[PDB]
C-alpha cells in the first residue's frame, strides 16, 4: 500500500493492541526511504517498544526460573531451551530495528531532536542485546551501545535545552546503562546528578511543557537515591 494506508493500518493495529502488526506496518513505511515525521517516528517506537518489551519480560521470567532450578536438571534443561528460543526472537527484533536505524533513520534525520532520539534508540537496542549476550560478543555489543549513547549525548549538549525531555530521557537511560551494564556506579551517579542539576539551573533562567521534563527529573533523582542507599 502507499505510505498513508500503512500509517493508517498502523494506528488501527495500535487501537487493537496488535503490536506485531503495527511494527510491520511501520517497518515498511520506514523502508520507503523518506525521513519520518514526528507522527511516524512515534508510531514506529511505540510499536517496537511493545514488541521487544514483551520478549524482555518473558526472558526475565524464564531466565529466572532456569536459575532457581537447582533441583531437576531436566526441568532446568527445558527452561534453558525455552529461554534460548525467546532470546532468538529477541535478537531478531533488535536486529531489525538496529538496521532500520543504520540504513534510514539516522542518515535521513535532518534535525537535532530526531537525531538524538534515534542515537539514544540505537543505544537502547544494543543495550537490550548486551543483556542476553555472553561473554564473547558481549564486550563488543556493550561498546556499540556506549558509542551510540555518547554520540547522542554530545549532540544533545550542543543543541538542546537541559530540560528537553529527549535530553533528560537520554540521560536517564545512559545512566542506567553505566550502572546495570558497565557496572560503574560512579559514572551513573555523576551523569544523572549533572543532568538533574543542569535542568534545575535552566528553571532559574526562565514555557514550554515541563510536566514531562519534571517526571524524568524525578526518575533521575529516584535513581540517585536508590544508588546511594
Amino acid at each position: 500500500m502507499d505510505k498513508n494506508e500503512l500509517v493508517q493500518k498502523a494506528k488501527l493495529a495500535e487501537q487493537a493492541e496488535r503490536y506485531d502488526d503495527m511494527a510491520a506496518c511501520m517497518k515498511s513505511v520506514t523502508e520507503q526511504g523518506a525521513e519520518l515525521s514526528n507522527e511516524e517516528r512515534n508510531l514506529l517506537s511505540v510499536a517496537y517498544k511493545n514488541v521487544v518489551g514483551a520478549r524482555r519480560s518473558s526472558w526475565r521470567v524464564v531466565s529466572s526460573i532456569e536459575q532457581k532450578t537447582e533441583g531437576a536438571e531436566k526441568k532446568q534443561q527445558m527452561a534453558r531451551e525455552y529461554r534460548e528460543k525467546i532470546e532468538t526472537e529477541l535478537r531478531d527484533i533488535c536486529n531489525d530495528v538496529l538496521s532500520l536505524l543504520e540504513k534510514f533513520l539516522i542518515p535521513n534525520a535532518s534535525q537535532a531532536e530526531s537525531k538524538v532520539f534515534y542515537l539514544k534508540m540505537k543505544g537502547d537496542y544494543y543495550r537490550y542485546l548486551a543483556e542476553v549476550a555472553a561473554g564473547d560478543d558481549k564486550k563488543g555489543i556493550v561498546d556499540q551501545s556506549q558509542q551510540a549513547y555518547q554520540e547522542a549525548f554530545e549532540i544533545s549538549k550542543k543543541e538542546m535545552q537541559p530540560t528537553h525531555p529527549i535530553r533528560l530521557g537520554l540521560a536517564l537511560n545512559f545512566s542506567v546503562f553505566y550502572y546495570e551494564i558497565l557496572n560503574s556506579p560512579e559514572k551513573a551517579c555523576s551523569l544523572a546528578k549533572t543532568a538533574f542539576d543542569e535542568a534545575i539551573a535552566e528553571l532559574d533562567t526562565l514555557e514550554e511543557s515541563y510536566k514531562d521534563s519534571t517526571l524524568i527529573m524525578q526518575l533521575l533523582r529516584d535513581n540517585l537515591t536508590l544508588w546511594t542507599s
Partner: peptide
C-alpha cells in the same frame, strides 16, 4: 503518553 515512546529505563 509522550514518555511512553521514549522507552525509559526508569
Amino acid at each position: 503518553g509522550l514518555l511512553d515512546x521514549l522507552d525509559l529505563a526508569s
